[PDB]
Amino acid sequence: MNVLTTSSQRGGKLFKVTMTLSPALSHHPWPSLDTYEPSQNSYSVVVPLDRLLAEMTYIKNKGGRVLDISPADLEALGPPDISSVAIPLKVELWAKADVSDVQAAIVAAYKQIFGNTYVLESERLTSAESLLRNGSISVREFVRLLAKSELYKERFFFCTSNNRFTELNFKHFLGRAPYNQSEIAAHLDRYQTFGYDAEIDSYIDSDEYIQAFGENVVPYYRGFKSQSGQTVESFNRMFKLYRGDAGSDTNLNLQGQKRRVDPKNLLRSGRGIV
Amino acid sequence: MKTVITEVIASADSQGRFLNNTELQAANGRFQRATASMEAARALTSNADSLVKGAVQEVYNKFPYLTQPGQMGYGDTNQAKCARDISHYLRFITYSLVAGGTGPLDDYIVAGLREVNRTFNLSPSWYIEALKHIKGKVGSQLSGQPLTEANAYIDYCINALS
Amino acid sequence: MKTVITEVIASADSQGRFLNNTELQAANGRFQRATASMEAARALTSNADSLVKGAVQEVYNKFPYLTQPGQMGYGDTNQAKCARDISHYLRFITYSLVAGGTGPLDDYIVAGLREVNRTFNLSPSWYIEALKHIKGKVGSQLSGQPLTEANAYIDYCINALS
Amino acid sequence: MKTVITEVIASADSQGRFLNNTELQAANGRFQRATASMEAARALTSNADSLVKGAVQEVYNKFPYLTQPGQMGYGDTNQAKCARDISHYLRFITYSLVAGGTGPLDDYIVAGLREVNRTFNLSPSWYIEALKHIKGKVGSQLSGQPLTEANAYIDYCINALS
Amino acid sequence: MKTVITEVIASADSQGRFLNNTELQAANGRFQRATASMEAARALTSNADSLVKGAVQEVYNKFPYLTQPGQMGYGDTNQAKCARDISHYLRFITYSLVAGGTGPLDDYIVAGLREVNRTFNLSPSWYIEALKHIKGKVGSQLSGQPLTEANAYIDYCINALS
Amino acid sequence: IAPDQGVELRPNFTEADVITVIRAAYKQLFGNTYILESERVIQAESLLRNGSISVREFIRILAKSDLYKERFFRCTSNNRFIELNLKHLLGRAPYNQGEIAEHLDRYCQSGYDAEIDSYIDSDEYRRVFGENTVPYFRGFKYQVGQSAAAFERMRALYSGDAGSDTDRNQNGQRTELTSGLADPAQPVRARTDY
Amino acid sequence: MQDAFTKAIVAADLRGSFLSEQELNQLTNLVKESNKRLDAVNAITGNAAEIISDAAHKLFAEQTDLIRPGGNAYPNRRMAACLRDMEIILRYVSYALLAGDASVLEDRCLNGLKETYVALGTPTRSVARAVQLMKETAIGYVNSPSGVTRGDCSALVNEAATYFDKAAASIA
Amino acid sequence: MQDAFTKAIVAADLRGSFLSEQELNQLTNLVKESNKRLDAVNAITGNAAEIISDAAHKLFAEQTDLIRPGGNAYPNRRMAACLRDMEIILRYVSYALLAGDASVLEDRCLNGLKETYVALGTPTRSVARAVQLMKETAIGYVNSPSGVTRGDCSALVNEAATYFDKAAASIA
Numbered sequence A: 001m002n003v004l005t006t007s008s009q010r011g012g013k014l015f016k017v018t019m020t021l022s023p024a025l026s027h028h029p030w031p032s033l034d035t036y037e038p039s040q041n042s043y044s045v046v047v048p049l050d051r052l053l054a055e056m057t058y059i060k061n062k063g064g065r066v067l068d069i070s071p072a073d074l075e076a077l078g079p080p081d082i083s084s085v086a087i088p089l090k091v092e093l094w095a096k097a098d099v100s101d102v103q104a105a106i107v108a109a110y111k112q113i114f115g116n117t118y119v120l121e122s123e124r125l126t127s128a129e130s131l132l133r134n135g136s137i138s139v140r141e142f143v144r145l146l147a148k149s150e151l152y153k154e155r156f157f158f159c160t161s162n163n164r165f166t167e168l169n170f171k172h173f174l175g176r177a178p179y180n181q182s183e184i185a186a187h188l189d190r191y192q193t194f195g196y197d198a199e200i201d202s203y204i205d206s207d208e209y210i211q212a213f214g215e216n217v218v219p220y221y222r223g224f225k226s227q228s229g230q231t232v233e234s235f236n237r238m239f240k241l242y243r244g245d246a247g248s249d250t251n252l253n254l255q256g257q258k259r260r261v262d263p264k265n266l267l268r269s270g271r272g273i274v
Numbered sequence B, C, D, E: 001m002k003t004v005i006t007e008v009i010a011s012a013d014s015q016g017r018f019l020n021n022t023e024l025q026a027a028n029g030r031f032q033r034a035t036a037s038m039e040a041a042r043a044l045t046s047n048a049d050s051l052v053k054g055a056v057q058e059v060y061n062k063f064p065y066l067t068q069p070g071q072m073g074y075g076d077t078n079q080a081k082c083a084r085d086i087s088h089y090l091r092f093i094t095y096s097l098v099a100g101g102t103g104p105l106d107d108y109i110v111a112g113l114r115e116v117n118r119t120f121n122l123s124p125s126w127y128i129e130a131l132k133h134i135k136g137k138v139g140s141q142l143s144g145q146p147l148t149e150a151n152a153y154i155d156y157c158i159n160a161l162s
Numbered sequence F: 001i002a003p004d005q006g007v008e009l010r011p012n013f014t015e016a017d018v019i020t021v022i023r024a025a026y027k028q029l030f031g032n033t034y035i036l037e038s039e040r041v042i043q044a045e046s047l048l049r050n051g052s053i054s055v056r057e058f059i060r061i062l063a064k065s066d067l068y069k070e071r072f073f074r075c076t077s078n079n080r081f082i083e084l085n086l087k088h089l090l091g092r093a094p095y096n097q098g099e100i101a102e103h104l105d106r107y108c109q110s111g112y113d114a115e116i117d118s119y120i121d122s123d124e125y126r127r128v129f130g131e132n133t134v135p136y137f138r139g140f141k142y143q144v145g146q147s148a149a150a151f152e153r154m155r156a157l158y159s160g161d162a163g164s165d166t167d168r169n170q171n172g173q174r175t176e177l178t179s180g181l182a183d184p185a186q187p188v189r190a191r192t193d194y
Numbered sequence G, H: 001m002q003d004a005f006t007k008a009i010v011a012a013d014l015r016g017s018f019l020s021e022q023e024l025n026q027l028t029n030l031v032k033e034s035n036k037r038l039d040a041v042n043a044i045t046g047n048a049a050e051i052i053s054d055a056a057h058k059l060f061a062e063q064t065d066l067i068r069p070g071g072n073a074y075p076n077r078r079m080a081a082c083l084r085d086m087e088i089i090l091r092y093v094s095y096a097l098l099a100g101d102a103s104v105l106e107d108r109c110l111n112g113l114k115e116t117y118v119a120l121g122t123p124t125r126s127v128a129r130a131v132q133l134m135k136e137t138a139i140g141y142v143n144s145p146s147g148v149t150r151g152d153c154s155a156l157v158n159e160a161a162t163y164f165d166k167a168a169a170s171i172a
């Protein structure tokens, strides 16, 4: 039932389903009380298209809750290829650029900071780019200037929860997944009492940020490689965070901007207080 | 979808087994038979228009009362949905001819037939009589093994409805 | 006993169903194929004597040591039981040819083969080499679809033994 | 045979359990209800003759063509077997009334209905129309809870036939 | 992995039951037996090198033809993979000795043995003869209950291969 | 058998337990009949070894296999096939001739694979074996709601451990239970030295 | 399961022999008549429903006791069982006819059938008659079909009859 | 399950149409080449064991890590599983080749499969390679067989290759 092979038999579109079952579907044949196996708390099964409506109806009745439906063939092509991003190409900005040096930087900051969503030409931050070109500001400010912009506020903040925002923030600004439940919490409390702007500053003035990017380096991916004071399970979070080269942050998804890192998963790396 | 090819493959798979001489002999039957089948298919295909109008009318001529007001052979929509339905049957007959088995008929018309007809107050008798008529006329469009094939599938539908 | 005829009947029965055009097309394959099959059968039948002596010897020529004392190709009884065994294989090959399927081979030689050979210290390699030789000589007794049939079944035995 | 009494007993037995207050409360319903049921039963019983002739005729009046030659409402034997069949339905309705459940209807008319009607070319529409008519007339033989009971079972047959 | 300890625990678990005097008596057997087992293990462990070279050679001395060109006892790679394979067997024998059961043999050599040997054209006879030889020499490295243990497991492999 | 001990297979199982569950499932579904290594459903055993299917779904794959169709369906009368499916999948004998009739009507309407699914998706299968227990013979106990004749009928179907359900000799393909069921008349043949 | 070839093979094997030139040509003839055989099986399949229906109408025309209360084809449940058995037997007769051997009929259908009916109280003589009527109509169809090439099918009509007659004899 | 005809039919039906004269003749051509197709499927069946064996010998020749302890084709149990999977994939490729459509391969075998191997710690790149070797040898046999009539089988050899290549791509 778990992770599948193959698709169809006569022909179908296999969908794999996931639920949470009562002892009504599955119980042991024991002398007392009806219980399902504790590890099949959420169970998944792959069903071809016709049997599918009948299965969902049954599951819902006898008590289960469907958690997901997704085609099997989507889910057979693995996990993302990460070769482009295991070790990236660094893009920095020199004192006295040749101009198109500066052209390189802007295109990359865009891609990285905005998480590969398209920024259309009406959309670009032109006055701010003027500033970088004249020196005036360094490659750090545009990383900070873009983040406080409406375009950044609008595709990533306004329409999703704070859990999601912060998780995106780590990916964009720091290039790495969020290590602890404390990190999520520490941030949510800051936004709540100092506002959005103070909270944005907190990733860009951090010691972690400063070491790796310094001030003239565009933030680049770095979570597919071992880092310091990183729990070990933050390397699996990175797969959940980045979905491949053609994937992007996208707020235009049918289901909306949502999570990607399970809250249960974060707790595995440690729980304390505050 | 049931064809000679899918059937032998299904039988091999279910015994965890490569196709053997038994199964390939079977397949040769289906391939040897394609010529007659496909001749029937082409004749039924180009005459479709008139085969359908012929059978539709025959349903009213055999059940005169259907065409009176308050009845189910009256008004543009009933008579339209009828032509369509016989056309569906002829369509799947040609598909079954081309496919080398009853699969298309089994999957798209037989599975569920009675439940649908019973909910919608559609008498099988009409459909049998549509098909009996189509069978009469196909007697002079084809002959030999193409006719036998056409007949095989028309009769298959009539038995599905009895 | 697996033949095209028994297979289609089995498949009908198990769905509680009359034989339909799918199943009769299949049967026609088996009947159309009988001529080539039965020519192979007649040629293998009359050459049996020499095909067997040819293959028996080839087992000793390929495994010279078998014919030394203390070995399993020595003495009248081993060499007698060998000829017999290859003769059993050719016999069931002709039966499979005539029957229109692997049934006779499946039921009388394949089911149980390894257990028996393992208890009696009989190496499949001998039997494969007997059959490889029989396959070499049957190249000039037959041709066309009779040869393909003979080959189909000889190869089927060789795969059963690997 | 499904009655309130048999149902509660079945449910107890299948849990290996004595009848408890849940099951005895249920039984009281069936016993409290007997008076209305049995009044319906007596009225349907003595009017049977005419209820049957009324419904038989109504099948011909609603399907005029049935009574023409070559048709299934023609000749003594068809018209005889029709009266009989409606009489069977009314009989089982009275039984279901008296029994306290649909059992008699389920076991003697519903189980198998469609297969039989389909083999014999009997349209449910006739039978629904026989029953719709019987329902019209039973409006003035009964009232109150006896009528509700009569209705319950007549309607049960009409749904069985749709 | 089958040991006396895992077996009794498995049997308790499957009846939802604490270990009782039956199961603890069993465990004492396995623990009382460890001394003889582990003496066999140490002797087989330090002689491994020569036990393997002795058995490898004996396979060629008993099947002389293996060492001729075109054969499977010829060239560095065949002869290398052979030593390795006998070494695998002795290794799992020592493991089974130390573990208190056939588990290591069952899981790492027996499960799948025949399929592998059959695909790769490896005759069990060689391996039996390797083991028969190892059994001959282990007669003078051990005695008493350590020898009985060594024997138990060598014989277990020989039966797995017949 | 008194109460035969039913084999439960639990998660994070090494193999020896999986090999024992596979042997138990084969002994239950095919009786004491020899199965060749070439006749084993290696794909289904591999899916069970990988934990990708439950013991219930492994039994569904074995019961739908062409080998189970050749031994129990092609060689036997429909009523004896139903008697044997109740024995192999549910560990019990039929309670009433109406139960044999409901399975026979489902077989005639929906075909073979739907009859097999009807035993395995039954609330009775889930209540007694769940997803992880191999089916075991149960008709030697009285259960709440069980007919007393179910014990005698289970004993007639269960010729002891040495019994072959495929025996072509004069009684093994005949309906041992159906002769009795239709009515008031009998008990089960005990092969009769017991 | 046997067919006519498989039967030959089993008898040959019991001698320890390759098929006799006798047996070979008997089987060559079966292949010779196989198109006719396919039409004959097709005649039954293509009219199965009517064959059962017409047999049925006539069975109850003759034996009006079966459809009275007390009768074995009353009420609807029993009539459906009787109609179902008519189909089952016609089915296995058609299988035997494709096979050229009665074994599937005898082994999967006729074996134990009489004793089943007696246990049930089903009047076997009436069942035998229903089989005789199916035979009449089935053969009718084998002999007079849609645009089949004209020739002689009497050998096949006989053989079909013996399958109907086996069933009747076995049941009565 | 689909075959090449069934596929045509499904696409036609989605238009609400009788098959196009376009589609008709594409299928007439498949019938035209069907004897060659039968030989091609027969080439694989007749050498299945050697195709798997030879692929295998060569896979472990290249990747000697799989047969060391720690390796995914060690000990005997795992090697037997690996040999079994080679057979399973070769089997569904032959089915697709008889059918003229990949669907049975994609639906019953491949498409997924990758996620199974991922959980099994089975190195998918090695499995992909074993499939590439089966392809080389299988096609070898399709192209150079016992007394088949001489002609051009390249169209069929390509199509067989795409089934091997589908499986490889799906798994790696």
Ligand SMILES: CCC1=C(C)/C(=C/C2=NC(=C\c3[nH]c(/C=C4\NC(=O)[C@H](C)[C@H]4CC)c(C)c3CCC(=O)O)/C(CCC(=O)O)=C2C)NC1=O
Pocket: A023, A032, A033, A034, A035, A036, A037, A038
């Ligand atoms: C593999 C061996 C195994 C374990 C360990 C197991 C645990 C387990 N405990 C369960 C329920 C339960 N477990 C408890 C236990 C407790 N309640 C409390 O308040 C206490 C804190 C605690 C006792 C110390 C309770 C109350 C339920 C029933 C929950 C409910 O149905 O509401 C269930 C649900 C099925 C059932 O109710 O039978 C499972 C599977 N099942 C197993 O098969």
Ligand SMILES: CCC1=C(C)/C(=C/C2=NC(=C\c3[nH]c(/C=C4\NC(=O)[C@H](C)[C@H]4CC)c(C)c3CCC(=O)O)/C(CCC(=O)O)=C2C)NC1=O
Pocket: A049, A050, A051, A052, A053, A054, A055, A056, A057, A058, A059, A060, A061, A062
């Ligand atoms: C707990 C009580 C219970 C419910 C409610 C239930 C629902 C249910 N409906 C199902 C299928 C189905 N349900 C429908 C229903 C519909 N199709 C339409 O187009 C309409 C919109 C609608 C009818 C109004 C159809 C068509 C299927 C079959 C889907 C398929 O197999 O393709 C299935 C899959 C299993 C099966 O096909 O038997 C379940 C479990 N099952 C249960 O056990």
Ligand SMILES: CCC1=C(C)/C(=C/C2=NC(=C\c3[nH]c(/C=C4\NC(=O)[C@H](C)[C@H]4CC)c(C)c3CCC(=O)O)/C(CCC(=O)O)=C2C)NC1=O
Pocket: A082, A083, A085, A086, A222, A223, A224, A225, A226, A227, A230, A231, A232, A233, A234, A235, A236, A238
């Ligand atoms: C809690 C302490 C801790 C551990 C243990 C840890 C493991 C870990 N290893 C990772 C990647 C990696 N780990 C390796 C390791 C190897 N590649 C090989 O071929 C060898 C077999 C092996 C070295 C012996 C490689 C190559 C990657 C990068 C994978 C990729 O991006 O493609 C990642 C993804 C994030 C990243 O790339 O930085 C994590 C989280 N992370 C942690 O925070």
Ligand SMILES: CCC1=C(C)/C(=C/C2=NC(=C\c3[nH]c(/C=C4\NC(=O)[C@H](C)[C@H]4CC)c(C)c3CCC(=O)O)/C(CCC(=O)O)=C2C)NC1=O
Pocket: B056, B059, B066, B072, B073, B074, B077, B078, B079, B081, B082, B083, B085, B086, B088, B089, B108, B109, B116, B120, B122, B126, B127, B130
């Ligand atoms: C894919 C194969 C397929 C078939 C065969 C099919 C039959 C079919 N016929 C229908 C209706 C109908 N069928 C007819 C048939 C007729 N009216 C007459 O004048 C004649 C008496 C007769 C033609 C012989 C009528 C009148 C309706 C409308 C019924 C209604 O909605 O009241 C409907 C209900 C949905 C609808 O209203 O279209 C279905 C599903 N549907 C399918 O998808």
Ligand SMILES: CCC1=C(C)/C(=C/C2=NC(=C\c3[nH]c(/C=C4\NC(=O)[C@H](C)[C@H]4CC)c(C)c3CCC(=O)O)/C(CCC(=O)O)=C2C)NC1=O
Pocket: C056, C059, C066, C072, C073, C074, C077, C078, C079, C081, C082, C083, C085, C086, C088, C089, C108, C109, C116, C120, C122, C126, C127, C130
């Ligand atoms: C119906 C199909 C069928 C087959 C295929 C068959 C094989 C078969 N070969 C056997 C023995 C034998 N088979 C051979 C074979 C050979 N000896 C040689 O010189 C050669 C190396 C080789 C021939 C290539 C030998 C020597 C024995 C005697 C084995 C013994 O009893 O020690 C036996 C043991 C019973 C007996 O001793 O006859 C069987 C069952 N039996 C069957 O019933």
Ligand SMILES: CCC1=C(C)/C(=C/C2=NC(=C\c3[nH]c(/C=C4\NC(=O)[C@H](C)[C@H]4CC)c(C)c3CCC(=O)O)/C(CCC(=O)O)=C2C)NC1=O
Pocket: D056, D059, D066, D072, D073, D074, D077, D078, D079, D081, D082, D083, D085, D086, D088, D089, D108, D109, D116, D120, D122, D126, D127, D130, G057, G060, G067, G073, G074, G075, G076, G079
């Ligand atoms: C115990 C419950 C029970 C029911 C309900 C029942 C129905 C039933 N009606 C039948 C026939 C029949 N039913 C009718 C019905 C009618 N003819 C007309 O004039 C009207 C249109 C219509 C009445 C509304 C006709 C004409 C036949 C003869 C069919 C034939 O044999 O051709 C038959 C076939 C056996 C026979 O010929 O008697 C059954 C079993 N049988 C039962 O045992």
Ligand SMILES: CCC1=C(C)/C(=C/C2=NC(=C\c3[nH]c(/C=C4\NC(=O)[C@H](C)[C@H]4CC)c(C)c3CCC(=O)O)/C(CCC(=O)O)=C2C)NC1=O
Pocket: E056, E059, E066, E072, E073, E074, E077, E078, E079, E081, E082, E083, E085, E086, E088, E089, E108, E109, E116, E120, E122, E126, E127, E130, H057, H060, H067, H073, H074, H075, H076, H079
């Ligand atoms: C963990 C337990 C375990 C065992 C027992 C084992 C046996 C084993 N022996 C093999 C090959 C082999 N085994 C031999 C054996 C021999 N050659 C000779 O000179 C002698 C005749 C004989 C030794 C008595 C040979 C020659 C091969 C190479 C076969 C080939 O690839 O052609 C292979 C194929 C993979 C490979 O080529 O290494 C396996 C799996 N593998 C295991 O993992």
Ligand SMILES: CCC1=C(C)/C(=C/C2=NC(=C\c3[nH]c(/C=C4\NC(=O)[C@H](C)[C@H]4CC)c(C)c3CCC(=O)O)/C(CCC(=O)O)=C2C)NC1=O
Pocket: A005, F042, F043, F044, F045, F046, F047, F048, F049, F050, F052, H066, H071, H072, H073, H078, H079, H081, H082, H083, H085, H086, H088, H089, H108, H109, H113, H116, H120, H122, H123, H126, H127, H130
């Ligand atoms: C639908 C048809 C079907 C396929 C394709 C299938 C694949 C499959 N392969 C499996 C295991 C396996 N597959 C392999 C295969 C390999 N090991 C290697 O190193 C090589 C790269 C490769 C051989 C070329 C191995 C070694 C295992 C056992 C893994 C383990 O248990 O550790 C399993 C787990 C169940 C089991 O072990 O039986 C499945 C389900 N199962 C199926 O039912």
Ligand SMILES: CCC1=C(C)/C(=C/C2=NC(=C\c3[nH]c(/C=C4\NC(=O)[C@H](C)[C@H]4CC)c(C)c3CCC(=O)O)/C(CCC(=O)O)=C2C)NC1=O
Pocket: F140, F141, F142, F143, F146, F147, F148, F149, F151
């Ligand atoms: C359909 C409802 C139903 C009934 C009635 C039933 C009777 C029944 N009683 C049994 C045993 C038994 N019954 C008794 C009863 C008695 N011993 C005495 O000395 C007393 C005279 C008497 C008590 C008043 C005993 C002692 C056994 C066990 C016999 C044994 O195993 O040795 C058994 C064998 C199975 C078992 O032991 O569970 C059945 C089937 N089973 C049923 O399912």
Ligand SMILES: CCC1=C(C)/C(=C/C2=NC(=C\c3[nH]c(/C=C4\NC(=O)[C@H](C)[C@H]4CC)c(C)c3CCC(=O)O)/C(CCC(=O)O)=C2C)NC1=O
Pocket: F032, F033, F034, F161, F162, F163, F164, F165, F166, F167
């Ligand atoms: C409880 C333990 C147990 C025993 C003892 C047992 C015996 C037994 N032996 C059987 C068959 C058999 N037994 C033999 C045995 C022999 N043939 C001979 O000629 C020799 C005299 C003899 C060997 C020494 C044969 C040949 C068959 C197959 C009979 C047939 O199918 O024609 C069968 C029928 C099922 C099957 O074929 O698998 C059973 C049940 N079954 C069991 O479960």
Ligand SMILES: CCC1=C(C)/C(=C/C2=NC(=C\c3[nH]c(/C=C4\NC(=O)[C@H](C)[C@H]4CC)c(C)c3CCC(=O)O)/C(CCC(=O)O)=C2C)NC1=O
Pocket: F077, F078, F079, F100, F101, F104, F105, G066, G071, G072, G073, G078, G079, G081, G082, G083, G085, G086, G088, G089, G108, G109, G113, G116, G120, G122, G123, G126, G127, G130
């Ligand atoms: C192997 C293929 C096969 C056959 C042949 C078969 C026969 C068969 N007929 C049965 C019943 C029946 N058969 C009939 C048949 C008839 N009643 C009459 O009056 C007529 C004389 C005759 C019709 C021509 C009837 C009425 C019953 C139901 C008996 C009852 O329950 O009272 C039953 C009891 C189970 C059930 O009712 O479904 C079986 C097993 N079952 C099978 O699986």
Ligand SMILES: CCC1=C(C)/C(=C/C2=NC(=C\c3[nH]c(/C=C4\NC(=O)[C@H](C)[C@H]4CC)c(C)c3CCC(=O)O)/C(CCC(=O)O)=C2C)NC1=O
Pocket: B033, B144, B145, B148, C021, C024, C025, C028, G032, G033, G035, G036, G037, G038, G039, G040, G042, G142, G143, G144, G145, G148, G149, G150, G151, G152, G153, G156
């Ligand atoms: C789809 C499965 C399938 C069928 C059904 C099939 C029938 C079939 N029947 C044929 C001949 C025939 N079929 C019959 C049959 C009859 N003659 C009569 O007068 C009787 C009414 C009837 C008795 C059964 C005759 C007489 C011939 C011509 C002689 C012959 O070819 O043997 C022929 C040879 C071509 C021809 O002459 O038309 C074919 C192909 N072929 C197939 O592949």
Ligand SMILES: CCC1=C(C)/C(=C/C2=NC(=C\c3[nH]c(/C=C4\NC(=O)[C@H](C)[C@H]4CC)c(C)c3CCC(=O)O)/C(CCC(=O)O)=C2C)NC1=O
Pocket: B021, B024, B025, B028, C033, C144, C145, C148, H032, H033, H035, H036, H037, H038, H039, H040, H042, H142, H143, H144, H145, H148, H149, H150, H151, H152, H153, H156
């Ligand atoms: C038992 C199932 C069955 C098979 C296997 C079968 C094969 C078969 N292959 C044929 C032709 C052929 N087969 C091939 C095949 C090849 N040519 C080559 O050079 C390649 C090496 C190979 C590529 C696959 C060719 C070229 C022809 C002749 C052209 C044709 O008939 O299409 C023919 C026509 C007669 C002939 O020319 O020999 C038959 C009947 N028929 C059957 O009923």
